[PDB]
Design a protein around this nucleic acid. Structure first.
Lengths: 221, 399
RNA sequence: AAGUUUGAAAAGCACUUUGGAAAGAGAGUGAAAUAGAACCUGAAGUCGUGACAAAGACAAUGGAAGUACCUCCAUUUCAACGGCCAGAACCAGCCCUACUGCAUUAUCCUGUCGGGGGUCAAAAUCCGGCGGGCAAAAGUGCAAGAAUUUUGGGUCUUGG
RNA sequence: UUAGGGAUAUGUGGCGUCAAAACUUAUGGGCUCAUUCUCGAUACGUGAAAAGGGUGUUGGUGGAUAAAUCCACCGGCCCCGAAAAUGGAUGACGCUUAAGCCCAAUUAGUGGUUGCCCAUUAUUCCUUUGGUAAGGGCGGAAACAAACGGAGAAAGUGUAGCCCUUCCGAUGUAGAUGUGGCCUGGAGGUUAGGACGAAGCUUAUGGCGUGAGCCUAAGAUGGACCGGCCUCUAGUGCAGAUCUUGGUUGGCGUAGCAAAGAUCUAACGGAGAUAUACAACAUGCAACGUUGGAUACUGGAGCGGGGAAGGAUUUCGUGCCAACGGCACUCGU
RNA sequence: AGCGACGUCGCUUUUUGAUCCUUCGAUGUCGGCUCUUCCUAACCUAGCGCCGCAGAAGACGCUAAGGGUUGGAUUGUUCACCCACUGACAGGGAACGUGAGCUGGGUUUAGACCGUCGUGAGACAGGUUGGUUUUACCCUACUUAGCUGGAAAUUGCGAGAAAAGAUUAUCCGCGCAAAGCGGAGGCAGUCCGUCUGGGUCUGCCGUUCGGUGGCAUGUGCUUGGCGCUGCCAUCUC
RNA sequence: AUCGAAUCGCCACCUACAAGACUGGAGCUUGCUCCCUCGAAGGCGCCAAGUAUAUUCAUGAUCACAAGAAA
RNA sequence: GUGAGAUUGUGAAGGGAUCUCGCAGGUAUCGUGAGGGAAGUAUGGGGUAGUACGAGAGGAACUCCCAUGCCGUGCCUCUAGUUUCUGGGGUUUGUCGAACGGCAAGUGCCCCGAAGCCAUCGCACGGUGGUUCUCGGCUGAACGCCUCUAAGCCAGAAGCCAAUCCCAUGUCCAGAUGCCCAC
């Protein structure tokens, strides 16, 4: 197990209850790369625990052959005398993002590595986070806002496919795999959701009548 | 300022570090692509190196000066007793790497295998696998074996088999090791449920080489080269030893760098190791897959020689001894010294060509002694050239 | 080069004990033996040893400002009491914020009649004539409007 | 334009993150797409680009033919022109409904009238110190015991400043001067201390001064001298000279102790052993002398036997192992 | 096509100058050898456009520096020339890379000779022969070789799974799943308090294990031997 | 078991997807008209299991980490 | 809380308090592979062919096949090199009385010499996808036509990226498993 035997032994010796910290989880499909990373970088310096998710689908402005070259100019730079100590080059889009964030953080101070260590990125949406709460979005980082639709753009996961990120197919098969499992379960619930949605209008009838005039005032009726 | 005359650099920067290998075992770093039409099969096998001989065969290659002619080709003999299959393991496929799912252990393991887990076995309490052999049965233990198979069927991409050597059935007292060398063997072909069907039928059963390989196929070998300990730059890399007059010695490299970078680059040749580095050769073509002496003697006889013989030379393979079990005979050198374990794996490189598709028919196999110059093929050929002899004239007086 | 200056006095450690011896452990002399022979005081620098503080690689130190744990050094307080820590009221000063008037408009306002323009047909944008006039408001120019004159905030940025 | 601090406000420069400020401001107008030194984006800083080109796009001027079109010319941004040696630089990431360029504004035709952040600056408040400093008080007004409103008040350059109120300045190399300004060995005075512990020494011993420094506390330190104050006096203040002398120290149990072939065994000596809290090896290692035996070297131009020069007790016997014979001695010059 | 005068605009820092900013209590000062790497203004190698490109050979240009770029005679030479091979024998940088890496032929000393100059000692960026090439054990780099902590990157107890599907109850297998299905040891004594339940121990009988005694088959296989399964039985569990 | 902790929103209705030159449905006249659920709302929680007749609270003595801990 | 140990300057023995530390991992195997390294490159011959082209003189190339140069990673069956195996034999001077056995000449010298090591002086092996540039096109406007481009698209270089190959969790793998503990 990842936890030590003692903090399993401690948690069982003090009992109480399982714990999870308050965590944000940001979807990332069609969020501009460098705008979404800034917003995230400033929330990591404020003490927030952020799970980035679907990094493959982040966008960049401009043609794909162009942003390929930008990353290839980044491969050209390595330490010539001993590259194992030369600047490292990460491929996988979740890693491209934690770098675009990281270089925007004071990463050489214990609060710069304390902020970064609170971010967690992913490809797709891993089961570790599929169902916990509702995914959030960064409306000033969105593509349908930030980019004129006339301009060509890139999908970070397609750019990073033609550098050494070979997991692209493995991810596309896990996204096709979940989005069914979710929408099968979603439509399954349509029997229940309509029950409640009916039970509010059906309750508004036999609910005491001086309250419903309040709901009509302040508008929930 | 530029170097006066260009010459190709010494050594291959892709085999760096020159580094003494983590294992003597020579495991395969990959396995060939899945065809997923061909029936499932095991893709590699553990093999012990015995020695080398040459052979005589006649080439069929239209277009060559050697066209229909006899050619003497050196050949390495590698004995390969049956491997036993102790386990099944399978691999979920994640956006980072493969990951094992579980492993299903056979219901019986020899002491050869659990000989691994201790480092002093005979003075151990010898409790390895004591508890599962107990829990692999009853009820809660029939279920858990069943749900990890069902885990493979649903969630697994690759499925492998844990197979170890038999060092009893190979009786060689120069190898010395009573621990059973263990590796995983990947099962290629068929759907994922068809692999579990095969692998579940292999457990506890032996695997002969001929089931894995075919005579004239090529197989590429994963093995660990002969360690020389620290060697100078001239043996380690090519470095064109310096002239006689030089002060402080001539086997050095002279200029290991410019002023700037003020550093020594990783590409400049230094001294060390020249080690037992791990290597995977390609396209080592199998000439003969033999059979054990006990079963089918006349190993080195042919449709041509017709003299009852075996592959073990007169006086044994030097430093190795007689090859008791079935063996592969394989054209060319294999890295590593005698006695070392190696794995033959189904060839990865695409095989379409005249050289690499051919039917090998051997005319002759050289059993002459490798000590000295052996001029005799068999012990009978020797007793004909001498005959009665002073120590022989004596032993008949014991009668 | 080198005080041979131990102590008042040699009283310069008898004796037991481990050791081949050097010495060690005891004991004894003396106010002091951490005055035991170079022997008064016995510094700096460097090293050992117990305890403890922690500490990633930013060479280390350094500045400023906190906090954590110690310190037991200092001063103070211990009952109709305090020189300690907090809040809340009021007072002077200071700072800040809210609160608005005087002029000005015309290359304008609004009728109407000629054009002119367009549209299915009109109106409008637009030029001219003749009446009337205050766009009642304008991002015009200046602004002095007593913030306890029973009610604006701040002062842990001042002192009571 | 800099005495030590606080507040408010600002300058140059800025408000996507790094990084304080538009949590990416406006309910402002345009223009721009740039494929391996990667479009552009801090003046001074060629700290990088020209001539010449472009039916890329966006404007304008002149002329011309009539459903709109055509010819010439001139701009803006962008592109070509545009090739260097370690991987690399709008400062980094990155930005394209700009986080780019030109212009403009302040919560936006809704009322005019200061968006926000940051200086050792400005304004103001407190504290210091110095003036070409400015002014006031200084003839004790009277009253007044403990027990069960106090205390100062000096005719003054400088102090722990005679007291108080006020105003301006305050950084600085070389250099000049001031200090009732700190320290040190001594001499003339004066006042004290000390075996109930002087000088010296040591300390997470605090207190005072802007500072040199002073002073108290502790010593499970010491063992006999010594402090303050006025004046005199000088061999009077240390971190640096390839400073002098003594000591110590990292490098370091490191380089190394490799010409002249070489020793081995047994018994005896010796403290140097055959050294042990359910056998012997696995738990006393290595090394020494003499005698016998073995093996080997010098090889008569000798590690043979005698003399000069030079040394001068090294010669010889007994004892002896502290130091010395760069390892070891039980041996020895 | 390929050139391109008279003019004109630039680039490069592999030439030589110009300057004198750094180093005179010292940065070892020519060339070769060795070795690595980088640049592209591309000689060969890959792909292509164009020609005064019929073919063959080649001219000019484009992307492109991944790979390759020699054996010798003479010279101290760099440079230069000729011989010979080759697909080609491209141009360079890295303190005019590279002397605690070497070499010491040259320059740049003391000896000596000649020529020219000087009355003379002596000079000559002229010629000649001979002329000491010192140190790494420190730090980093690099090449190999070991030991070893560590996620708040040593601490906080500061909790995040590229997990699975649910409240003390699912008891398990299957199913995307809905629907739906097949399979679940029991009995008798104990403690403790929330639909009776939990927590163990004990007595009793069973299935799947466990280990003892007999009989075949598959596999392997000796140094006629090593070992395991298989049915039954008993025993233990 | 040290241990006393900083944290202060729960959920088996959010915890599926997509688009933004567009996503309630439709007609020709293609920017207007008409229809619907009217196109701008995850649910719940915030002191009686529920909006009405109730019912312990102190002395923890005006602020102090909330002296509280399973929504 | 529980276990252990400390509290060392001026004597002994008590007790008390306090401080520090341990209190759950250990050990063995099979694997994942982020990142970093990176490699094969070039020619000749057969054949096409005396063909295309050309008046002739002359004179190509691709698929395919076979070899080779340079480089790389190995290997020791063969052949070659090496011998302190002082292996066996020979042999010179000296030497133990001769012979035998030897011995000294720092390995006397000579011939042969296994194992091992080793040689482009021997032997073996050295490969697959994709994104793009240049360029040639398709569809197709701007601009009633035209146009490879403005939007979209095709083909596509020894370049660049990945597969293979080398080191690999300080990439802290909640990857899998063996066994003993602790809970």
């Amino acid at each position: 197990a990842f936890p030590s035997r003692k903090d399993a032994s401690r948690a069982q010796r003090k009992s109480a209850k399982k714990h999870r910290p308050e965590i944000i989880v940001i979807d990332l499909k069609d969020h501009v790369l460098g705008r979404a990373a800034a917003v995230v970088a400033k929330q990591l310096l404020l003490g927030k625990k952020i799970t980035v998710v679907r990094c493959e689908q982040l966008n960049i402005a401009g043609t794909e052959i162009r942003n390929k070259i930008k990353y290839l100019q980044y491969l050209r730079k390595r330490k010539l005398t001993n590259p194992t100590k030369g600047p490292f080059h990460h491929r996988a889009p979740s890693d491209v993002f934690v770098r675009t964030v990281r270089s925007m953080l004071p990463r050489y101070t214990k609060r710069g590595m304390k902020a970064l260590n609170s971010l967690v990125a992913y490809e797709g949406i891993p089961p570790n986070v599929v169902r916990t709460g509702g995914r959030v979005v960064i409306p000033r980082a969105q593509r349908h806002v930030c980019y004129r639709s006339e301009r060509p753009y890139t999908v970070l996961g397609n750019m990073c496919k033609h550098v050494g990120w070979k997991y692209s197919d493995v991810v596309a098969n896990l996204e096709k795999a979940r989005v069914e499992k979710a929408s099968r379960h979603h439509e399954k619930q349509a029997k229940l959701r309509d029950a409640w949605k009916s039970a509010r209008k059906e309750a508004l009838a036999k609910m005491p009548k001086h309250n419903v005039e309040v709901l009509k005032k302040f508008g929930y009726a | 300022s530029h170097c006066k005359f260009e010459h190709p650099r010494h050594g291959h920067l892709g085999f760096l570090p020159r580094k003494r290998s983590r294992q003597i075992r020579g495991r395969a770093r990959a396995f060939p692509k899945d065809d997923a039409t061909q029936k499932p099969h095991l893709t590699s096998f553990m093999v012990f190196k015995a020695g080398m001989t040459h052979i005589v065969r006649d080439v069929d290659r239209p277009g060559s000066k050697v066209n229909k002619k006899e050619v003497v080709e050196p050949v390495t003999i590698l004995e390969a007793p049956p491997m036993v299959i102790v386990g099944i393991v399978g691999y979920r496929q994640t956006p980072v790497g493969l990951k094992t799912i579980g492993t299903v252990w056979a219901h019986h393991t020899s002491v050869e295998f659990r000989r691994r887990y201790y480092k002093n076995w005979k003075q151990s309490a010898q409790l390895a696998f004591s508890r599962q052999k107990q829990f692999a049965n009853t009820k809660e233990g029939k279920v858990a074996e069943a749900r990890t198979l069902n885990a493979f069927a649903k969630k697994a991409s690759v499925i492998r088999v844990i197979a170890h050597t038999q060092l009893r059935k190979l009786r060689n007292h120069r190898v010395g090791v009573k621990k059973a060398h263990v590796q995983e063997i990947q099962v290629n072909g068929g759907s994922v449920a068809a692999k579990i069907a095969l692998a579940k039928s292999l457990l506890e059963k032996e695997v002969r080489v001929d089931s894995v390989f075919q005579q004239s196929e090529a197989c590429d070998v994963c093995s660990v080269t002969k360690g020389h300990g620290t060697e100078g730059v001239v043996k380690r890399w090519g470095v064109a030893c310096l002239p006689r007059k030089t002060h402080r010695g001539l086997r050095k490299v002279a200029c290991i760098g410019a002023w700037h970078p003020a550093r020594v680059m990783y590409t400049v040749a230094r001294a060390g190791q020249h080690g037992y580095h791990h290597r995977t050769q390609l396209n080592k073509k199998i000439y003969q897959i033999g059979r054990s002496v006990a079963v089918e003697p006349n190993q080195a006889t042919t449709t041509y020689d017709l003299t009852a013989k075996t592959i073990t030379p007169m006086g044994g393979f030097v430093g190795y001894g007689t090859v008791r079990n079935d063996y592969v005979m394989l054209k060319g050198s294999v890295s590593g010294p005698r006695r070392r374990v190696m794995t033959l794996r189904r060839p990865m490189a695409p095989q379409t060509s005249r050289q690499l598709k051919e039917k090998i028919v051997l005319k002759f196999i050289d059993t002459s002694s490798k000590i000295g110059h052996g001029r005799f093929q068999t012990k009978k050929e020797k007793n004909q050239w001498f005959g009665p002899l002073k120590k022989d004239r004596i032993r008949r007086e014991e009668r």
